[PDB]
């Protein structure tokens, strides 16, 4: 509350560390459904159904330009990429399985780096 604060967690390396995680997600062999925005002209149903599209390139641009106020807003956009994928793709598809694999990979890196 006013003039009463928990001890200051060091957040000075968060930008760099989120960049490294994002590099490792970019270079994973199952990243290919997630590298670029879904083409809304060429994928019937996507625009109407997926209210907030998100992809790795868009997270990279937001990160590089100071559009994440903190490390949690960064994790929300990463998770959004996988929630969107589950919304549109069957579990038993190459893309559906890719999404599950990447989400696992992300959550471990996140825990090991920050928890």
The number of folded domains in the chain is 1
Q: Which domain holds residue 41?
A: 1-115
Tell me the technique behind this structure.
Answer: X-ray
77-83: long-range pairs with CB below 8 Å, 24+ = 78/22, 78/25, 78/106, 79/103, 79/106, 80/52, 80/54, 81/34, 81/54, 81/55, 81/56, 82/106
Given resolution (angstroms) = 1.8
The CATH number given to whatever domain includes residue 105 is 1.20.920.10
CA distance to 17, 63, 85, 94, per residue, from 90 (Å): 32, 30, 9, 9
């Amino acid at each position: 509350s006013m003039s009463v604060k928990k001890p200051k967690r060091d957040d000075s390396k968060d930008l760099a560390l989120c960049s490294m995680i994002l590099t490792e997600m970019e270079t994973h062999e199952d990243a290919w459904p997630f590298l670029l925005p879904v083409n809304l002209k060429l994928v019937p149903g996507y625009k109407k159904v997926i209210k907030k599209p998100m992809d790795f390139s868009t997270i990279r641009e937001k990160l590089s330009s100071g559009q994440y106020p903190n490390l949690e807003t960064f994790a929300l956009d990463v998770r959004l990429v996988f929630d969107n994928c589950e919304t549109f793709n069957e579990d038993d598809s190459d893309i559906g399985r890719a999404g599950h694999n990447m989400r696992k990979y992300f959550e471990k890196k996140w825990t090991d780096t920050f928890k």
